[PDB]
Each structure stands twice: as C-alpha cells, then as structure tokens.
C-alpha cells in the first residue's frame, strides 16, 4: 500500500542525520537479520508485494539476469518453506548481498505514475 517512494523518502529523511542513523541503523540491521527471510534465500526486494500494477511494471522492466536470479531465489524459498528447512549460514543470503536491486525500477515506475496523476489533475 505505502508507496515505495514514501518509504525511501522517510529512510533518507532519517539517514541524513547521524543523530538518528547511529541509533536506528544497527536496529534496522538486527531487525532484517532476525526477519528470517535471508535464511530462506530471499532478498528484501523479493518479499515486495508483486500484485500491484506499479510493482508488475517494475518487474517487467527488470534485466534478464536479475529476473532469472530472482526467479531462482523465489523458487528456492518456496521449496524451503515447503520442506520446512532453512539454508545454513554458509548458504544464507549474506547481509551485503541485499543490494536493493529492484528499488530503482520501482521508484521509476512510481515517479511515472505520480507525474501522470499530477499532470492530469491540473
């Protein structure tokens, strides 16, 4: 529901101030680690709700190699949840591989939609 643009804006609103970054960033890292999605072979972007026209458009514009890697990650996560087993720390998605690969495309789609709405509303 929340626009990816809004969450990115809030995250940059926080990160621009070390006073709050130094407090929240460790907490955010611990929360993402404890979120349990990495151990299933998933990156943050894989969790995003695909069933939205903006999200579908962003996915369609994804490069071939990234799209195939995402498909494999989703399939692996489904298999793991089905088998009720988790990847070990060796095979788990390390924190540094959470590259937020899909955010730029989602933001481009959101900007296009917002421009359309702003232009047709005048």
């Amino acid at each position: 529901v929340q626009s990816m643009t809004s969450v990115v804006k809030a995250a940059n609103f926080i990160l621009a101030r070390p006073t709050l970054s130094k407090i929240i960033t460790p907490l955010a890292q611990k929360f993402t680690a404890y979120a349990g999605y990495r151990e299933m072979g998933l990156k943050f972007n894989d969790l995003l709700l695909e069933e939205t026209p903006i999200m579908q458009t962003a996915i369609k514009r994804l490069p071939s190699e990234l799209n195939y890697s995402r498909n494999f990650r989703i399939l692996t996560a489904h298999q793991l949840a089905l088998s009720h087993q988790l990847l070990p720390a060796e095979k788990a998605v390390k924190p540094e591989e959470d590259d937020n690969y899909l955010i730029p495309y989602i933001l481009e789609a959101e900007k296009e939609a917002f421009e359309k709405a702003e232009l047709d509303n005048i």
Binding site: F72, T76, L82
Partner: peptide, 8 residues
C-alpha cells in the same frame, strides 16, 4: 516435491 532440488 519434498525431495525436489534445483540448479541455476
């Protein structure tokens, strides 16, 4: 399906 594996 439980024993299913994949390679990429």
């Amino acid at each position: 399906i439980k024993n299913r594996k994949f390679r990429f």
